[PDB]
Design a protein around this ligand. Structure first.
Ligand SMILES: *[C@@H]1O[C@H](CO[C@@H]2O[C@@H](C)[C@@H](O)[C@@H](O)[C@@H]2O)[C@@H](O[C@@H]2O[C@H](CO)[C@@H](O[C@@H]3O[C@H](CO[C@H]4O[C@H](CO)[C@@H](O)[C@H](O)[C@@H]4O[C@@H]4O[C@H](CO)[C@@H](O)[C@H](O)[C@H]4NC(C)=O)[C@@H](O)[C@H](O[C@H]4O[C@H](CO)[C@@H](O)[C@H](O)[C@@H]4O[C@@H]4O[C@H](CO)[C@@H](O)[C@H](O)[C@H]4NC(C)=O)[C@@H]3O)[C@H](O)[C@H]2NC(C)=O)[C@H](O)[C@H]1NC(C)=O
Ligand SMILES: *[C@H]1O[C@H](CO[C@@H]2O[C@@H](C)[C@@H](O)[C@@H](O)[C@@H]2O)[C@@H](O[C@@H]2O[C@H](CO)[C@@H](O[C@@H]3O[C@H](CO[C@H]4O[C@H](CO)[C@@H](O)[C@H](O)[C@@H]4O[C@@H]4O[C@H](CO)[C@@H](O)[C@H](O)[C@H]4NC(C)=O)[C@@H](O)[C@H](O[C@H]4O[C@H](CO)[C@@H](O)[C@H](O)[C@@H]4O[C@@H]4O[C@H](CO)[C@@H](O)[C@H](O)[C@H]4NC(C)=O)[C@@H]3O)[C@H](O)[C@H]2NC(C)=O)[C@H](O)[C@H]1NC(C)=O
Lengths: 207, 208
């Protein structure tokens, strides 16, 4: 069997109303010796407020078991390490893995929206672009909207490391050209720790 | 935990330009001293082939052997979706390991290439962002380069291909230039290479 430790989702750590969670995911657990334990430490100290989830069988004979610790927003955002221990009869010894947020001074994203290229405007569907650059660390969340209604048809590139050590990404929202034509306003929402109130938005309209 | 095998495909650019030499590479690692002998077999669509070039093994600093075999592939063969199988045998193995690689299956689709000038809010800053949007391509193997006046740029970074809901791929490439150049009115050029482009090339320019 193996181990894989994972961080909160960015959106989760940035809005106080949401519940950010770290999660140990153990793979290639077998029927024989099926009992898997966990233990959790935050900055090494044992913490007890965690919750192992009930298990699941995989096709390939082997299980996929998963524990979950809830986390404080400021704790994660201040670099505390989240260590997860895992035990099992088919071990050499107790596995262990660790995670924490990237080190470094947070850097604020600059957010630009770009209209469709002339060349694409004539087509049935046009592409609205949102360029987010200069941000550190790479934990970020992007969303689109019009009229305070969530647009659903957009995709966002992963963050890419730029030449100066910050990250950028693009988000592409595709809309039927008419909406673009009618003059509707579209907005790109960006969530990031270095932003005032973890959040900014930029609008895109036909001029 | 015996030998492990990794099979790497050609670089996209190499399969698209007849001048270059696309290769598939079968890398074996963690080969022991106990059994250091390694045998490669190569198959192109199930049919065994014999022109592969296998380098002599190399001890790594962790006292395991690394062995590499290189199969030169024909461009039209890779682009016609032939499958390349590497087969690795070692006396430490319960059975031989086999890995297979090919161009991703599906129908190719031509990229649409679009260049976007700097946002107004950014035309101010000392340095400015030229964007090349490449959309609607399949499969995701692609190459993007920026040029001005025949010379390559360098200050550019490109996203990985992203899956776009209609099944095709898109990506953005970002060229960064000093504000002066952009206002001085130099044409900057975004080259794309892809199997589904005529001549496997297109190029769009960007200026003020
Ligand atoms: C003893 O030492 C050797 C040598 O190691 C080297 O030196 C030591 C001292 C250390 O410093 C090492 O860090 C250093 O690498 C060890 O050999 C290594 O063995 C590991 C596995 O244990 C290999 O990992 C794999 O790497 C490939 C990527 O490999 C390219 O990139 C590396 C740099 O990032 C580079 O070093 C490699 O040489 C290689 O470079 C490429 O070479 C080709 C051929 O020449 C060339 O054309 C390319 O241009 C070039 N690319 C460059 C420069 O970037 C990685 O892809 C593998 O990931 C797959 O498999 C994993 C399983 O191990 C899995 O977790 C991953 O998710 C991934 O899974 C696969 O993913 C594909 C698609 O993503 C998917 O289709 C499959 O489903 C899936 N396959 C599965 C599940 O198997 C993997 O991480 C190292 O490459 C290798 N190093 C070298 C130089 O060969 C050895 O392990 C040591 N042993 C010990 C500790 O005892
Ligand atoms: C039999 O099947 C099982 C189950 O597989 C599944 O079912 C079968 C039947 C098939 O259909 C499969 O295709 C199918 O997926 C296999 O179990 C898989 O086992 C592998 C290990 O062999 C595990 O590998 C790893 O995956 C993680 C990422 O997994 C997160 O992302 C996955 C997609 O990428 C996703 O599937 C997971 O669910 C999980 O996702 C997330 O879930 C969390 C928690 O719920 C959630 O909060 C997240 O939001 C969500 N994320 C997303 C995107 O949805 C990957 O991280 C592991 O990677 C590293 O490890 C490699 C070595 O294992 C190494 O080569 C890589 O380079 C990389 O190494 C790390 O690199 C970083 C940076 O460079 C470095 O900092 C780290 O130190 C380094 N790590 C270290 C220390 O090694 C790894 O690839 C799969 O998770 C697991 N799949 C599932 C679904 O459980 C099993 O292997 C099969 N068995 C056999 C014999 O074949």
């Amino acid at each position: 069997p193996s181990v894989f430790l994972f961080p909160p989702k960015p959106k989760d750590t940035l809005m106080i109303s949401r519940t950010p969670e770290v999660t140990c995911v153990v793979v290639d657990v077998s029927h024989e010796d099926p009992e898997v334990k966990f233990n959790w430490y935050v900055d090494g100290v044992e913490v007890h407020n965690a919750k192992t989830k009930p298990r699941e069988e995989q096709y390939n004979s082997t299980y996929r078991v998963v524990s979950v610790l809830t986390v404080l927003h400021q704790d994660w955002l201040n670099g505390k390490e989240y260590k997860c221990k895992v035990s099992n009869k088919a071990l050499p010894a107790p596995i262990e893995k660790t995670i924490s947020k990237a080190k470094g001074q947070p850097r604020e994203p600059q957010v630009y929206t770009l209209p469709p290229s002339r060349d694409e405007l004539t087509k049935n569907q046009v592409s609205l672009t949102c360029l987010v650059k200069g941000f550190y660390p790479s934990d970020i969340a992007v969303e689109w909207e019009s009229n305070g209604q969530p647009e659903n048809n957009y995709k966002t590139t992963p963050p890419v490391l730029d030449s100066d050590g910050s990250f950028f990404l693009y988000s592409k929202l595709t809309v039927d050209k008419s909406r673009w034509q009618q003059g509707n306003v579209f907005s790109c929402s960006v969530m990031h720790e270095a932003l005032h109130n973890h959040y900014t938005q930029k609008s895109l309209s036909l001029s």
